[PDB]
From a paper:
Laccases (EC 1.10.3.2, p-diphenol: dioxygen oxidoreductases) are among the very few enzymes that have been studied since the end of the 19th century. These multicopper enzymes catalyze the one-electron oxidation of various aromatic compounds, coupled with the full reduction of molecular oxygen to water. Most of the currently known laccases function in acidic conditions at temperatures below 60 °C, but two-domain laccases (2D) oxidize some substrates in alkaline conditions and above 70 °C. In this study, we aim to establish the structural factors affecting the alkaline activity of the 2D laccase from Streptomyces griseoflavus (SgfSL). The electrons from the substrate are transferred via the His–Cys–His pathway to the TNC, which is formed of one T2 copper ion and two T3 copper ions (T3α and T3β). For this purpose, we constructed mutant forms of SgfSL by combining previously obtained substitutions that significantly increase the catalytic activity of the enzyme (Met199Gly, Met199Ala, and Arg240His) with the substitution Asp268Asn that is outside of the TNC environment.
The triple mutant Met199Gly/Arg240His/Asp268Asn was obtained in order to further study the functional role of Asn261 and Asp268. The NH2–C=O rotation of the Asn261 group could not be accurately observed due to the relatively lower resolution of the structure. However, functional studies revealed significant changes in the oxidative activity of the triple mutant. The extended pH activity profile (from 7.5 to 8.5) of 2,6-DMP oxidation was detected. Moreover, the rate of 2,6-DMP oxidation by the triple mutant form at pH = 7.5–8.5 was almost the same. The expanded pH activity profile for the triple mutant may confirm Asn261 and Asp268’s involvement in the process of proton transfer to the TNC copper ions. However, the absence of a manifest shift in pHopt can be explained by His240 being a stronger proton donor at pH 8.5 than Asn261 at lower pH values. The combination of Met199Gly substitutions with Arg240His (involved in proton transfer via the T2 channel of SgfSL) increases the efficiency of 2,6-DMP oxidation by 16-fold compared with SgfSLwt. That was not the case with the triple mutant Met199Gly/Arg240His/Asp268Asn, where the Asp268Asn substitution doubled the efficiency of 2,6-DMP oxidation compared with Met199Gly/Arg240His and increased it more than 30-fold compared with SgfSLwt. The efficiency of 2,6-DMP oxidation (kcat/KM) by the triple mutant form Met199Gly/Arg240His/Asp268Asn at pH 8.5 is about 34 s−1 mM−1, which makes it one of the most active laccases in alkaline conditions.
Numbering used by the authors:
A (entry chain B): 41 to 317
B (entry chain A): 40 to 317
C (entry chain C): 41 to 315
């Protein structure tokens, strides 16, 4: 459907936990941490209280992009908003609709594709926490935004995708016609360029033109550096049909070293033409 | 000097991949006529293009395009078994579509814009050797009513080279003050770049020109780009600046000192370029 | 506070001086050269005459972005538009309003967040001059732009902010409510990603959406590379209140090695909670 107007106050538990291999992740339920962390979804105007527990043995933080938070929810050591080993703390994120200011100018709303990550593990910029996997997607919708059938997050962290061993995807499945949403976050040291075979989107808030008067470049390829976040919705297979549609960083060595995955768009019968496993 | 019409024609073209001097490989429209960059494809939103392809090399090659509609059988990857074995032939079909209102009430963007095609199998199964070797080219898909330029020039930053040329060898392009000049800019390889033109500027959007007083697109003369990025614009040569040898270059400092520079030689109506002196 | 319609003829002297430590800077009076250079503001339509003088022992130039200049003001040795040691030149920049061409298309105005820099020190592309400090900002306003209470310029020159040593800011101060203009320039070899805590803006010309029909992405983070320039206006603390709000390049080793600084937003009473 469509996103309603917001303004609810939401509460959720979140945990930072150690995972295998010196990795670390956020999770909504203890023992269910993951990398990327859980996807947060808000309608503009919602407030979200994150009751947060650090189950690790090193201080950790929650720092969000793009949303409204006071300095006590910055999630940084420099204003003592980190969480000590064993400690707990409520982080609050607010968001707002757009509107006219009394000064006659237009105040942008919070709507968009954002992300949260650690800011204190290893360095005062979270270089270790981010590298171990403390990051996840936040989506803030505007009233009237079209809603997807599925959302998939794709995170270029250094030379990996979602901290996975090279050459292991992830793959994402869908049926021709599905309204599929991608969240694309970049973290760490390197720039990249994100490409999707067979698909394309508009380079604006939503990845869809708002109608025939929207001048945004339509693209299938985008450069991004650390902490960028963007998102788009595609119709699976539109104009192209089913198949295993590669997506990859297009920096050539990066695709050859395993920053590749498969958008597996299936016919209505669940098969993928020409896909040999 | 007119306007792109509505599309819908079924077009067909022969294209070859052939070796060139120095281990370079290029696309062509006629045998022994390959160029780096390869030849420019122009479609109008709605055209279907059939590329009757021929590999004239000893090694496999493929043809993968950005942005245009193609089924999985015209992917041009080994993974999808759509490459060309040596001495072989294959018809690649690219389709395009106009914008329109979907059933769900949303708006489908049309295929129009500045795109490109490259190899996907030489060297690695991502075309890393093929792209290095020069197997890349521009595709312009126009929307009904897009202004057409007096000339189109293509500028490809392939790694540390421009159009696989030697350093400090341009290329240079000429125009006359007031010409509507179209630039296609494509990037390939490992490195990010920043493309700058002295004397000129454009809007960062689909066409490179604002649509009217309401278009918020930023106006820029410098643009960060990366591998497989492609954008395009039309400028008016000499606009508010006049004739002269207008340099263009990548703006990463080391890249411009190594020779990623060229000239936009804009001439007065009589043919003179003030102060030019190679 | 709105910008007026342009069209004045303005004049300015500019000097290129050595500074401490093999650095070089532009300045509006002798012995007043700064890194980054002095902020030049113009309205769409203005012409600006820069009487430039090179007080250095090596040739220097002055090249601009985005503005209208003839080839004689290009500011490169290629056109012999460089200034030899001790010498003087007048560089002339012009600007235009938007409006429709005879051929029917829309011509964009000059308004934007631009900059100027050397083109001949060290190499024929100013690599040594830029590395040395020879860059500064230029803002050009469109009639009706809203004006700001303060403009701050932030230049990522390779691994430094404004050629400063690592971990030495700079910091900027405001008061909750203040309407602040940031100018962001990048020079050198590297790409960066600029990021501000607690604040966000629109990725368009002005930094703010024109109204509900602007589709520009709203962001708090932007990739950029050498000779990119952009700007934006924020309402300090808007929706977030006071505090020492960090900015930095978000490339992890850059923030770790000192490409960081603070945006100090004060309560009306002067104080910064938590600082
Ligand atoms: Cu930070
Ligand atoms: Cu990459
Ligand atoms: Cu592709
Ligand atoms: Cu961040
Ligand atoms: Cu590919
Ligand atoms: Cu370059
Ligand atoms: Cu320039
Ligand atoms: Cu490609
Ligand atoms: Cu230059
Ligand atoms: Cu940086
Ligand atoms: Cu932040
Ligand atoms: Cu420059």
């Amino acid at each position: 459907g469509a996103a309603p107007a917001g303004g609810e106050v939401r509460r959720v538990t979140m945990y930072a936990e150690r995972l295998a291999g010196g990795q670390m992740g956020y999770g909504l339920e203890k023992g269910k941490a993951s990398i990327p962390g859980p996807l947060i979804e808000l309608n503009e105007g919602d407030t979200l209280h994150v009751e947060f527990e650090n189950t690790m043995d090193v201080p950790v933080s929650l720092h969000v992009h793009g949303l409204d938070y006071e300095i006590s929810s910055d999630g940084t050591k420099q204003n003592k908003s980190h969480v000590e080993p064993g400690g707990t703390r409520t982080y609050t994120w607010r968001t707002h609709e757009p509107g006219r200011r009394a000064d006659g100018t237009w105040r942008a709303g919070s709507a968009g594709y954002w992300h949260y990550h650690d800011h204190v593990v290893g360095t005062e910029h979270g270089t270790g926490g981010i590298r171990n996997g403390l990051y996840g997607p936040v989506i803030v919708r505007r009233k009237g935004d079209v809603l997807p059938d599925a959302t998939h997050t794709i995170v270029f962290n250094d030379g990996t995708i979602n901290n996975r061993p090279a050459h292991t995807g992830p793959n994402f499945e869908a049926t021709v016609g599905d309204r599929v949403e991608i969240v694309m976050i970049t973290h760490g040291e390197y720039y990249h360029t994100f490409h999707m075979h067979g698909h394309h989107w508009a380079d604006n808030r939503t990845g869809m033109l708002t109608g025939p008067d929207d001048p945004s470049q339509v693209i299938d390829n985008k450069i991004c550096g650390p902490a960028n976040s963007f998102g788009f919705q595609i119709i699976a297979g539109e104009g192209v049909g089913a198949g295993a549609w590669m997506y990859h960083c297009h920096v050539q060595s990066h695709s050859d070293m395993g920053m590749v995955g498969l958008f597996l768009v299936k016919k209505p019968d669940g098969t993928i033409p020409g896909y040999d496993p």
